[PDB]
Amino acid sequence: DNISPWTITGFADAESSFMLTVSKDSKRNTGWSVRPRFRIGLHNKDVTILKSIREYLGAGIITSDIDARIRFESLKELEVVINHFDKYPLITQKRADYLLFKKAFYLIKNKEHLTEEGLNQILTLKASLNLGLSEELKEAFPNTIPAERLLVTGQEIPDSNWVAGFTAGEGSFYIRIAKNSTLKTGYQVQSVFQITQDTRDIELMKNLISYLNCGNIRIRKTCVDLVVTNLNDIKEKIIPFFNKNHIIGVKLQDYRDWCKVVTLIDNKEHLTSEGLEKIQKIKEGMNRGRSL
DNA sequence: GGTCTAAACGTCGTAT
DNA sequence: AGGAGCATTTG
DNA sequence: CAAATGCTCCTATAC
DNA sequence: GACGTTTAGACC
Ligand SMILES: [Mg+2]
Ligand SMILES: [Mg+2]
Ligand SMILES: [Mg+2]
Ligand SMILES: [Mg+2]
Ligand SMILES: [Mn+2]
């Protein structure tokens, strides 16, 4: 069963990397090797997420050693990647990374990089890309101005599957058991839904809430969590949403278990000892407690 | 004051 | 998630 | 040859 | 990402 282009970019907003590697190479005429890359790497457990992305695009090399990756490094394969994101844009601050990457891509594809002028222009871009220029690259190209980075603002969720894609990456479905004397069982049971993202996209988080019509912002010193704790919102909004917009990967099974636990809470089995014991068993085979 | 939900407040460690 | 470079193939 | 791409190993904090 | 405890205060 094929994936949706929107869950792809959603997941890519969450997990993907756009990269430029600039390495010394005296064999080249500038003395420097310049290449672009696009990659997603994750736990071996989710090889099959990459496989469904590879089936979709018909491009990309998949590896599996200590982790599992899908990479696009040739021009032929990057054309496919750029055809994708021009048609289905990113909406996090990764958009800015992408626009820099795309800039550098054209330079390279057009061979404009085999040139002092090009090489320099490509560094301005690298300087503003993800982690910027390293201490040694800063030395090799002294006082090179970082290219202007688009501050990505006022973004509207383009498709509901974008959310399913993004929460497949940054989302979490867990059950919170709290030691509390004032409950007959001695514990509080709660269903929590969560999305996490660096504070630079707090704007985006704030209207995911508007999009879903539920949840609270939580700033932890920074990061931002979108947290839904309200049981009714989980019952009427979150579950039916993800029932329509499918999570991909192993998280699907955590979602199912979680969803099963919501029913139990809904039927109030969490207020009886047998209920609590049952939930604890499901919960312990869930997220961090699942296996091979 | 008993029982409970919501959510504020808190932290660990590795998948990404 | 993000990084860098040696190894090998290409034209 | 020199340029492109393959392959594989290093780093570390946003989730 | 996912696990844990404390606090505000609703409802009976
Ligand atoms: Mg991320
Ligand atoms: Mg994950
Ligand atoms: Mg990082
Ligand atoms: Mg993460
Ligand atoms: Mn992530």
Side-chain angles (χ1 to χ4, degrees):
Chain A
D1 217 21
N2 214 3
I3 204 173
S4 153
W6 278 120
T7 113
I8 296 188
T9 101
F11 191 75
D13 262 311
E15 305 313 300
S16 70
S17 270
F18 301 90
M19 295 169 287
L20 261 31
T21 311
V22 176
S23 293
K24 195 72 195 174
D25 194 357
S26 69
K27 274 156 141 59
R28 333 281 282 220
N29 287 1
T30 64
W32 287 94
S33 156
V34 177
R35 81 196 276 171
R37 321 159 190 263
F38 161 75
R39 204 165 62 215
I40 301 171
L42 42 74
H43 191 106
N44 289 320
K45 76 193 181 219
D46 280 321
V47 154
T48 139
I49 294 184
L50 312 173
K51 282 205 137 207
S52 55
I53 290 166
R54 159 79 218 198
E55 194 198 353
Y56 192 98
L57 299 170
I61 304 166
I62 295 167
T63 53
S64 182
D65 37 77
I66 78 136
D67 66 40
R69 296 169 169 209
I70 187 168
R71 80 187 146 86
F72 305 72
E73 292 187 329
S74 75
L75 286 186
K76 167 177 180 177
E77 291 177 320
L78 291 171
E79 265 170 63
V80 169
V81 169
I82 282 158
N83 281 171
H84 182 244
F85 291 109
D86 289 353
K87 188 165 30 165
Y88 298 95
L90 300 144
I91 69 178
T92 59
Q93 298 305 126
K94 221 163 215 76
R95 213 295 158 111
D97 291 305
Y98 173 70
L99 261 33
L100 292 158
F101 173 86
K102 179 173 148 61
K103 235 96 154 77
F105 176 73
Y106 272 84
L107 289 192
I108 297 164
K109 166 192 157 61
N110 294 343
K111 303 211 165 237
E112 273 161 327
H113 71 306
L114 293 171
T115 268
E116 269 278 77
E117 306 96 74
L119 175 73
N120 295 331
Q121 175 48 212
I122 258 148
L123 284 139
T124 62
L125 305 170
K126 215 247 196 277
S128 290
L129 206 44
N130 310 303
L131 294 180
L133 303 184
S134 78
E135 221 227 11
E136 31 277 314
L137 274 179
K138 278 186 187 156
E139 221 130 3
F141 304 91
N143 315 289
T144 142
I145 318 298
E148 209 208 298
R149 184 175 213 271
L150 180 63
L151 296 167
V152 196
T153 179
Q155 331 91 292
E156 305 295 58
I157 323 301
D159 198 84
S160 68
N161 286 333
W162 185 88
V163 182
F166 189 73
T167 101
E170 316 291 34
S172 202
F173 302 96
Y174 57 91
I175 302 307
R176 198 198 279 153
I177 314 291
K179 186 162 184 66
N180 182 328
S181 307
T182 71
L183 276 127
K184 313 194 90 158
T185 51
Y187 298 90
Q188 191 185 169
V189 177
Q190 267 188 304
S191 56
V192 185
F193 168 63
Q194 191 184 259
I195 312 167
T196 312
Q197 199 63 193
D198 196 76
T199 300
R200 77 226 221 295
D201 283 308
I202 190 167
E203 203 201 329
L204 179 69
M205 303 299 269
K206 273 188 174 168
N207 52 10
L208 261 66
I209 296 188
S210 308
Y211 190 72
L212 295 168
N213 206 111
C214 66
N216 289 295
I217 290 296
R218 188 277 211 97
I219 301 108
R220 42 158 161 169
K221 36 210 283 182
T222 77
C223 262
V224 184
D225 299 73
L226 179 161
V227 185
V228 184
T229 40
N230 185 92
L231 220 225
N232 198 241
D233 290 329
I234 284 155
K235 281 196 301 167
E236 313 273 74
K237 292 171 186 154
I238 305 299
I239 287 167
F241 186 86
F242 294 111
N243 283 6
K244 219 234 212 333
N245 311 280
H246 312 309
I247 298 309
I248 56 165
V250 172
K251 191 157 281 144
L252 215 210
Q253 305 302 149
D254 300 316
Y255 175 70
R256 273 169 186 162
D257 293 351
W258 186 80
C259 184
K260 283 176 196 188
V261 172
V262 173
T263 300
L264 299 172
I265 301 163
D266 189 38
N267 300 331
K268 282 139 215 303
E269 313 211 343
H270 66 291
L271 305 167
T272 76
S273 278
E274 278 84 357
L276 175 60
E277 290 178 75
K278 187 190 298 296
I279 290 164
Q280 267 161 4
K281 233 87 239 305
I282 302 169
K283 175 180 173 275
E284 274 142 27
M286 269 185 64
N287 301 304
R288 201 207 72 213
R290 208 169 288 283
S291 42
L292 186 85

XYZ file of all heavy atoms in Angstrom, chain A residues 51-93:
352
model
N 12.068 2.057 2.382
C 11.677 1.219 1.251
C 10.412 1.736 0.578
O 10.300 1.690 -0.646
C 11.507 -0.241 1.672
C 12.831 -0.966 1.834
C 12.689 -2.471 1.657
C 13.839 -3.024 0.806
N 13.458 -4.270 0.086
N 9.478 2.252 1.369
C 8.259 2.817 0.804
C 8.490 4.186 0.165
O 7.785 4.563 -0.768
C 7.130 2.848 1.833
O 7.534 3.529 2.996
N 9.486 4.921 0.656
C 9.907 6.167 0.012
C 10.650 5.895 -1.300
O 10.475 6.621 -2.289
C 10.780 7.028 0.949
C 9.930 7.585 2.093
C 11.444 8.177 0.190
C 10.734 8.161 3.235
N 11.477 4.850 -1.304
C 12.205 4.449 -2.504
C 11.253 3.944 -3.597
O 11.414 4.297 -4.760
C 13.310 3.431 -2.152
C 13.826 2.555 -3.294
C 14.807 3.264 -4.205
N 14.593 2.870 -5.600
C 15.470 3.040 -6.583
N 16.648 3.586 -6.342
N 15.171 2.655 -7.812
N 10.261 3.141 -3.214
C 9.213 2.691 -4.142
C 8.487 3.890 -4.766
O 8.223 3.902 -5.969
C 8.211 1.757 -3.436
C 7.271 0.964 -4.362
C 6.028 0.400 -3.637
O 5.939 0.501 -2.386
O 5.129 -0.146 -4.320
N 8.193 4.901 -3.948
C 7.474 6.081 -4.410
C 8.257 6.905 -5.431
O 7.754 7.201 -6.517
C 7.057 6.973 -3.239
C 6.065 8.036 -3.657
C 4.700 7.857 -3.454
C 6.491 9.209 -4.286
C 3.783 8.823 -3.850
C 5.585 10.178 -4.694
C 4.232 9.979 -4.473
O 3.332 10.935 -4.882
N 9.478 7.286 -5.075
C 10.262 8.187 -5.911
C 10.954 7.461 -7.051
O 11.237 8.062 -8.086
C 11.284 8.961 -5.070
C 10.731 9.881 -3.964
C 11.841 10.395 -3.044
C 9.920 11.054 -4.536
N 11.216 6.168 -6.865
C 11.972 5.386 -7.845
C 13.414 5.856 -7.928
O 14.050 5.798 -8.979
N 13.922 6.335 -6.804
C 15.271 6.837 -6.721
C 15.746 6.664 -5.286
O 14.932 6.679 -4.350
C 15.309 8.299 -7.124
N 17.058 6.488 -5.116
C 17.671 6.462 -3.790
C 18.328 5.142 -3.452
O 17.830 4.081 -3.817
N 19.454 5.214 -2.755
C 20.190 4.026 -2.375
C 19.949 3.765 -0.893
O 20.129 4.666 -0.069
C 21.710 4.166 -2.680
C 21.923 4.488 -4.162
C 22.461 2.894 -2.290
C 23.326 4.983 -4.509
N 19.535 2.544 -0.562
C 19.260 2.182 0.819
C 20.383 1.325 1.394
O 20.799 0.344 0.781
C 17.904 1.436 0.967
C 16.734 2.350 0.598
C 17.713 0.922 2.397
C 15.423 1.607 0.406
N 20.868 1.694 2.576
C 21.848 0.871 3.283
C 21.359 0.523 4.679
O 20.495 1.208 5.231
C 23.235 1.539 3.390
O 23.093 2.851 3.943
C 23.905 1.618 2.036
N 21.920 -0.548 5.237
C 21.594 -0.982 6.583
C 22.811 -1.604 7.259
O 23.204 -2.739 6.952
C 20.431 -1.972 6.557
O 20.088 -2.358 7.871
N 23.421 -0.843 8.162
C 24.493 -1.370 9.000
C 24.169 -1.102 10.473
O 23.270 -1.752 11.035
C 25.884 -0.871 8.564
C 25.881 0.577 8.073
O 25.832 1.501 8.915
O 25.939 0.786 6.840
N 24.862 -0.154 11.098
C 24.511 0.208 12.473
C 23.189 0.993 12.490
O 22.452 0.980 13.474
C 25.661 0.940 13.231
C 25.756 2.411 12.827
C 27.002 0.209 13.037
C 25.954 3.312 14.006
N 22.908 1.667 11.381
C 21.636 2.316 11.169
C 21.199 2.047 9.740
O 21.930 1.424 8.971
C 21.737 3.826 11.424
C 22.626 4.544 10.407
O 22.584 4.214 9.198
O 23.379 5.448 10.818
N 20.010 2.529 9.395
C 19.454 2.373 8.058
C 19.276 3.733 7.377
O 18.708 4.668 7.960
C 18.139 1.629 8.124
N 19.769 3.836 6.144
C 19.748 5.092 5.395
C 19.195 4.918 3.983
O 19.248 3.819 3.403
C 21.158 5.671 5.302
C 21.728 6.047 6.628
C 23.203 6.378 6.557
N 23.634 6.975 7.821
C 24.624 7.853 7.951
N 25.327 8.251 6.889
N 24.909 8.334 9.154
N 18.654 6.015 3.456
C 18.370 6.173 2.034
C 19.050 7.474 1.617
O 18.850 8.520 2.240
C 16.839 6.164 1.705
C 16.599 6.168 0.190
C 16.099 7.320 2.370
C 15.154 5.866 -0.230
N 19.890 7.398 0.591
C 20.633 8.563 0.165
C 20.412 8.869 -1.303
O 20.100 7.986 -2.104
C 22.131 8.420 0.496
C 22.937 7.565 -0.460
C 24.358 7.362 0.052
N 24.858 6.041 -0.307
C 25.438 5.763 -1.462
N 25.619 6.732 -2.362
N 25.849 4.530 -1.718
N 20.557 10.145 -1.629
C 20.513 10.631 -3.001
C 21.755 11.487 -3.200
O 21.884 12.548 -2.597
C 19.228 11.441 -3.232
C 17.967 10.687 -2.888
C 17.630 10.421 -1.557
C 17.123 10.228 -3.894
C 16.475 9.720 -1.233
C 15.951 9.533 -3.582
C 15.628 9.273 -2.252
N 22.691 11.011 -4.007
C 23.954 11.716 -4.173
C 24.296 12.047 -5.625
O 25.032 12.997 -5.873
C 25.103 10.964 -3.491
C 25.002 10.953 -1.973
C 26.227 10.361 -1.288
O 26.883 9.461 -1.869
O 26.521 10.790 -0.146
N 23.768 11.284 -6.580
C 23.983 11.611 -7.984
C 23.011 12.691 -8.437
O 21.960 12.895 -7.829
C 23.848 10.376 -8.870
O 22.492 10.002 -9.017
N 23.378 13.372 -9.519
C 22.532 14.377 -10.148
C 21.184 13.831 -10.606
O 20.163 14.507 -10.484
C 23.247 14.961 -11.353
C 24.402 15.927 -11.136
C 24.834 16.486 -12.493
C 24.019 17.045 -10.168
N 21.199 12.616 -11.154
C 19.992 11.962 -11.651
C 18.987 11.810 -10.520
O 17.796 12.086 -10.691
C 20.336 10.594 -12.274
C 19.133 9.680 -12.548
C 19.537 8.372 -13.238
C 18.318 7.489 -13.501
N 18.687 6.249 -14.238
N 19.492 11.398 -9.361
C 18.658 11.114 -8.201
C 18.220 12.379 -7.477
O 17.124 12.435 -6.926
C 19.376 10.150 -7.249
C 19.523 8.751 -7.827
C 20.302 7.806 -6.937
O 21.326 8.220 -6.331
O 19.890 6.630 -6.855
N 19.067 13.398 -7.485
C 18.716 14.649 -6.839
C 17.676 15.432 -7.627
O 16.850 16.130 -7.032
C 19.955 15.491 -6.568
C 20.852 14.899 -5.486
C 22.156 15.665 -5.421
C 20.149 14.897 -4.144
N 17.705 15.306 -8.954
C 16.652 15.866 -9.796
C 15.283 15.348 -9.350
O 14.308 16.101 -9.302
C 16.890 15.540 -11.274
C 17.616 16.634 -12.055
C 18.053 16.183 -13.454
O 17.189 15.857 -14.305
O 19.273 16.166 -13.710
N 15.229 14.065 -9.004
C 13.989 13.449 -8.561
C 13.565 14.063 -7.233
O 12.389 14.387 -7.039
C 14.103 11.899 -8.492
C 12.918 11.285 -7.779
C 14.197 11.323 -9.884
N 14.531 14.261 -6.344
C 14.274 14.850 -5.032
C 13.779 16.284 -5.133
O 12.868 16.688 -4.417
C 15.534 14.804 -4.157
C 15.365 15.661 -2.901
C 15.853 13.359 -3.797
N 14.376 17.052 -6.033
C 13.999 18.441 -6.188
C 12.671 18.583 -6.926
O 11.846 19.431 -6.570
C 15.153 19.266 -6.782
C 16.163 19.550 -5.658
C 14.652 20.569 -7.402
C 17.548 19.873 -6.111
N 12.439 17.731 -7.920
C 11.115 17.649 -8.504
C 10.060 17.384 -7.426
O 8.924 17.865 -7.524
C 11.051 16.580 -9.592
C 11.644 17.047 -10.926
O 11.804 16.242 -11.843
N 11.964 18.339 -11.042
N 10.426 16.637 -6.386
C 9.442 16.329 -5.367
C 9.095 17.521 -4.500
O 7.921 17.842 -4.334
C 9.819 15.158 -4.467
C 8.754 14.847 -3.463
N 8.946 14.965 -2.105
C 7.452 14.504 -3.629
C 7.825 14.663 -1.476
N 6.901 14.382 -2.377
N 10.121 18.160 -3.944
C 9.920 19.247 -2.996
C 9.548 20.578 -3.622
O 9.015 21.427 -2.933
C 11.134 19.402 -2.074
C 11.303 18.263 -1.124
C 12.337 17.359 -1.287
C 10.404 18.075 -0.072
C 12.487 16.288 -0.406
C 10.551 17.003 0.808
C 11.588 16.112 0.639
N 9.826 20.785 -4.903
C 9.247 21.949 -5.575
C 7.715 21.803 -5.639
O 6.983 22.777 -5.437
C 9.843 22.174 -6.970
C 11.299 22.670 -6.929
O 11.821 22.975 -5.829
O 11.923 22.754 -8.014
N 7.246 20.576 -5.873
C 5.823 20.285 -6.057
C 5.086 20.114 -4.724
O 3.878 20.348 -4.645
C 5.666 19.052 -6.957
C 4.241 18.696 -7.412
C 4.240 17.689 -8.596
C 5.464 16.720 -8.592
N 5.324 15.527 -9.503
N 5.820 19.721 -3.683
C 5.266 19.466 -2.352
C 6.182 20.049 -1.256
O 6.806 19.301 -0.505
C 5.099 17.956 -2.138
C 4.150 17.263 -3.089
C 4.618 16.627 -4.244
C 2.779 17.231 -2.834
C 3.739 15.990 -5.124
C 1.896 16.591 -3.703
C 2.380 15.974 -4.841
O 1.497 15.350 -5.687
N 6.266 21.392 -1.165
C 7.245 22.114 -0.328
C 7.307 21.740 1.159
O 6.313 21.321 1.743
C 6.805 23.575 -0.469
C 6.154 23.635 -1.792
C 5.440 22.331 -1.950
N 8.485 21.908 1.757
C 8.657 21.767 3.200
C 8.085 23.024 3.862
O 7.953 24.060 3.205
C 10.140 21.611 3.546
C 10.851 20.402 2.937
C 12.279 20.742 2.579
C 10.802 19.205 3.868
N 7.741 22.933 5.148
C 7.193 24.090 5.868
C 7.886 24.444 7.200
O 7.579 25.479 7.805
C 5.641 24.016 6.068
C 5.261 22.911 7.060
C 4.913 23.891 4.720
C 3.776 22.823 7.326
N 8.809 23.603 7.657
C 9.626 23.979 8.804
C 10.732 24.919 8.347
O 10.755 25.342 7.198
C 10.236 22.762 9.503
O 11.041 22.033 8.572
C 9.149 21.861 10.064
N 11.652 25.258 9.239
C 12.832 26.022 8.831
C 13.767 25.212 7.912
O 14.750 25.743 7.385
C 13.594 26.552 10.043
C 12.807 27.509 10.906
C 12.243 28.685 10.141
O 11.038 28.947 10.199
N 13.104 29.406 9.417
